[PDB]
Amino acid sequence: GMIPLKIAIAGANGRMGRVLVEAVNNHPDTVLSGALEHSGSEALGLDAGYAVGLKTGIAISDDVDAVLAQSDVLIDFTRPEPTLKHLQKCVEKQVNIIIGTTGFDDAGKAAIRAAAEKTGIVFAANFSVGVNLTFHILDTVARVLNEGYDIEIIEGHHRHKVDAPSGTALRMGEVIAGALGRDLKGHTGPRDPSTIGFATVRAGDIVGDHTALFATDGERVEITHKAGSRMTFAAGAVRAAVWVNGKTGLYDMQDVLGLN
Amino acid sequence: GMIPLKIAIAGANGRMGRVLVEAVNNHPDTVLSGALEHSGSEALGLDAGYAVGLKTGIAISDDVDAVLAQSDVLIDFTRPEPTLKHLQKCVEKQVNIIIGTTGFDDAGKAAIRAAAEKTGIVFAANFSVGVNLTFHILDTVARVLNEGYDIEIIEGHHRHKVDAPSGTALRMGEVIAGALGRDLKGHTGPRDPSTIGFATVRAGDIVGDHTALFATDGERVEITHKAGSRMTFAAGAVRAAVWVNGKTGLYDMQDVLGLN
Amino acid sequence: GMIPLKIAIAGANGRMGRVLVEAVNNHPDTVLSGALEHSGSEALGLDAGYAVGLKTGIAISDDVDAVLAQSDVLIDFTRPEPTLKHLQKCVEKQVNIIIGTTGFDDAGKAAIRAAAEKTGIVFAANFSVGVNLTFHILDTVARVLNEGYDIEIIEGHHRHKVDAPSGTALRMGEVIAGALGRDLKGHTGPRDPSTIGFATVRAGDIVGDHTALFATDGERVEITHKAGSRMTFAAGAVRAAVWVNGKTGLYDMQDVLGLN
Amino acid sequence: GMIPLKIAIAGANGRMGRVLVEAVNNHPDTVLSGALEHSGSEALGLDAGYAVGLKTGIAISDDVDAVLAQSDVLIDFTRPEPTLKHLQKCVEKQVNIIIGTTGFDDAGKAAIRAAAEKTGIVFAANFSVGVNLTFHILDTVARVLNEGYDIEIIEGHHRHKVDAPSGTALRMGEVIAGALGRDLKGHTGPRDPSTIGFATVRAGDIVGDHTALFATDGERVEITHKAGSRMTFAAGAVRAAVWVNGKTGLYDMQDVLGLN
After folding, report:
1. What is d(CA C22, CA C1) in angstroms, rounded to the nearest whole number?
2. Residue A193, preceding bond cis, omega within 30 degrees?
3. Within this chain, do residues D114 and D143 fall inside the same structural domain, yes or no?
4. In this complex, is the C-beta atom of C55 within 8 Å of any C-beta atom belonging to chain D?
5. What is the CATH number of the domain that holds D258?
6. Chains A & D: contacts with CB separation below 8 Å
């Protein structure tokens, strides 16, 4: 597509969907061209920006074919089943797709791989630019600080969060353990292999703080990500939409960010 | 005693003792008049400041009677048994005593109480001015934030530390639980009683960081103490020496700080 | 009023108003009974919770008399002029009022004082429970740490914030300077009066972080408030509504929190 | 040299020298073989570890030729003039040299370059492993976060520190500005070039904290170094000694750490 890129948002009335509308609004190379919901949504017919203070001119719709016909890229952070119906239609209409939906098993992932032969896809477990950058720099840090350091993955989340450690924290752990030549799960001297541990805070409504702490005698290095809202994932999803414009293939956020 | 106050340091060659020598040096109302070690110390006869860059003129000595005869106050962060021998001599010589030694049981504590009838004593589990202030303000904070908050006591210590949570963290917990009308050890709504938990980091050579985190929807309050070295305990011990000058009785750091 | 307390929200379509709707929803002793906007609002006739996922049954209205007639308390974080029209009607209808509106000069403040003879008012520069608690504990901290400490007020705010230091930071400064017996604006030894300074970070979309750092040789004490969203002010405004129920008079957040 | 590597320490009685003695003691591949001071030092004839609790068997000496004759590497964090006398003798005796001394101008740097033709040298402005790693990762971070972020270099130091921002902070700035294609010294949208600023805290006896904060809408990334003591520089200097064993040439800490 020509600039500006015409973006459609699935699940436009959900929490991710609203922030995505704002993310499309903030990026100067994109415009909102569609906003999808299922046929039961209380929000059908409302302006896509009604809950975030924007007049987009785009009525929230359940007409998937009509929306895709006038869009260049669909951004989808919904559930696996509806995402894969949207996928088939993107393929048919030659629309790119940014899949932030998680929870696919082997057969869902195969479906995504197959469609990537025919359209541009960015499929990532996490769309935060900062998080993905953290995963990348942690490999380097852990290689250099491979002896003599105690390594702790510290995370803070909202009270009712079920998974401890979070998926992000576990990934940070896997990157570090990998860089140390190890598999995940006294005094550490200068030639002792650096050690890994996890600490978890569950409190209030914390969106998510993740710190990798590398500590030795006389120093601490801390690599920290702090999420203030879902805008971090939304902004990275829109960056990915812009990046994958004009491409066919299966990409991830490492590709988007020019890493590895 | 007249100013300047003449301070003697027990265990002058240990880690606390050296920092105490520096603490006496830094405070303008005090001077070093004695520095005690046991008869086996490699440091007998050396200047008390030999390891901290100071020329005090005070030879490290094992002559307890001679040192006490020319001092106004003894500061002692050693072990219970030698501390209680020093106690008897302070009583005899009318010297005040700042007891930072920990690990007394009921009979040691009774001995301290008895001697406080005859000399000035400050006996505290912790001599850090900041820590004791933290214990005091936590009562207030927890009373006001008694509903609706998730409370977490987070601490960082050096790798080989045995006790988790630390004694300081446990005290912070007891103060908070007490303020909530409770005994120590889902979503918290605005009228739900505030909850307490502990998180522990063991890494590197961290002297000790303690945070009490109070979290609710939309906000965090954090009350934090960071120890950079043993100087925090030493400086509070010297403040206590100055405070207890001219007094007889058993006092603690709440007294020294004018709290409660 | 009987429980549940019937709350009306002014400026219901603004940023504070939406969060207030959520705050009334979360508190079990309150219910939403009115939601006011001016006659030009695009949101007249919409459900008060339309932008925050709640079905309140309350249509956003411009009928001030009708709304006040069926409410016990109005919460108002709007502008001085419209707030003072609402004030007159609260007086007439015997409705309490929580004034979070700022920017009153001497004549506005006199108007609020006068109406407090006839209805219950809580009027505070800041409705965050944590912030007001911070202002209170800082007095104590600064009294105890009155000699020997370097004191720094550190704040982080969103990029385009105009005022540096923020009003909160300046208040923290005034409380501290006051506790030190001073007026606002080398090595600090143990008997030197503690010193005050300010540091400011302007970056991203940070809602607001405020830290008072007290530092000396060997230790740091940090008293920190972190705002994650406007819910902190909204939740404190609803606490104040509940507190002032059954009272006549002019109160502030120190009263609400049982402080001083 | 064979393992264990025989290390000599210049300025053995200074602050860096003492920590270096401890660093040599902690590393299992090194042993202390000499400890140098000038002819006026009060510490001549004392054991090199007298102030740090170690019995090294090495008398602090002013006999530079004798010490170098029995050592493989000299570690020197002293002053330019005495360092360059030591340099000439290392060249003569075929001893490697780790130069942590700073403040050389063009002619001193030329002298170091010349001697590197004849012996192994590691010459770095900063020997902290964590700091040098930070400088390296900041290039990557700033390249990826090149648009849309506000970047702040925040540092904390002891009260009487003269230089603001510190040399480390200025270097962090130069690395970032360089990565952004710029020279050092409103709302930042997603395609706006990321901006740089500095904030400085002067307080207490803080050894040195440095944070690079990258902030945008919805997220913060923080890359932080915290120095607890001079051991961080000392430990990196000993790592460099071990690394440069068996080499001739001029190297820096990027080389030691296997970076670039």
Report:
1. 21
2. no
3. no
4. no
5. 3.40.50.720
6. 143
At position A179, the amino acid (one-letter code) is: A
**Residues B34, C239: Cα–Cα separation, whole Å:** 58
B161 catalytic residue (yes or no)? yes
Report residue D4 as tokens: 């264990």
Q: Is A128 on the interface with D (CB under 8 A)?
A: yes
Claim to verify: residue A198 and residue A250 sit in the same structural domain? no
CA B49 to chain centre: 22
Tell me which chain B residues have a C-beta less than 8 angstroms from the C-beta of C242. none
Residues B42-59 as b or e (16 or more Cβ within 10 Å = b): ebbebbbbbbbebebebe
User: Could you tell me if D25 and D66 lie in one domain?
Assistant: yes
Q: From the list B152, B186, B218, which residue is nearest A203 (CB)?
A: B152
Q: Does D189 touch chain A (CB under 8 A)?
A: yes
Contact state of D229 with A238 under an 8 Å Cβ cutoff: no
* Residue C259 contacts A where some CB pair is shorter than 8 Å: no
CB within 8 Å of A65: residues ≥ 6 apart:
A89, A93
CA distance A101 to A87: 12
Residue pointed to by tokens 């109480």: B113
Q: CATH number, domain at D153? A: 3.30.360.10
Let me know whether B211 and B184 are in one domain: yes
CA A191 – CA D27 distance, rounded (Å): 7
Residue A55 token pair: 């007049």
Distance CA(C119)–CA(C136), nearest Å, equals 27
Q: Is A243 on the interface with B (CB under 8 A)?
A: no
| B206, B218 contact by CB (below 8 A) | no
Query: Could you tell me the two tokens for A20?
Result: 């995505």
- Domain check: are D85 and D178 in the same one? no
Contacts with A260 (C-beta within 8 Å, 6 or more apart), sequence order: A136, A254
Instruction: Mark yes or no for CB contact A197/B199 under 8 Å.
Output: no
For residue D164, give both structure tokens.
């603001």
Nearest-CB residue to C216 (from B189, B218, B235):
B235
Which amino acid, A95? V
Number of domains in chain C: 2
| Contact call for A52 and C50, based on CB within 8 A | no
* Chain centre distance of CA A85: 20
Can the peptide bond before residue A190 be classed as cis, meaning omega within 30 degrees of 0?
Answer: no
Report the alpha-carbon distance of residue B95 to residue B240 in Å, rounded. 14
Give residue D24's domain range.
1-128+229-260
Pair (D140, D223) in one structural domain: yes
| Method by which the coordinates were obtained | X-ray
Closest CA to B130 of B260, B34, B225, B65: B225
User: What's the rounded Cα separation, in Å, for the pair B132 and B125?
Assistant: 10
Tokens 């459609």, residue located: A8
- Rounded to the nearest 10°, the torsion over CA C59, C63, C69, C75 is 70
CB D69 within 8 A of CB D93: yes
Could you tell me where the DSSP H helices lie in D99-252?
A: 106-115, 129-144, 167-179, 231-244
Given its phi and psi angles, is residue A253 left (phi above 0), alpha (psi -120 to 50 degrees) or beta?
A: alpha
Tell me which amino acid residue B88 is: Q
Answer yes or no: do D180 and D241 share one domain.
no
Contacts of B189 in chain C (CB under 8 A): 26, 28
Same domain, D175 and D110: no
CA distances from C62 to A38, B8, B162, C45 (A): 34, 77, 65, 9
**At residue D192, what is the residue type?**
D
**DSSP letter, residue C59:** B
Q: Which of D178, D153, D179, D129 is nearest to A140 (CA)?
A: D129
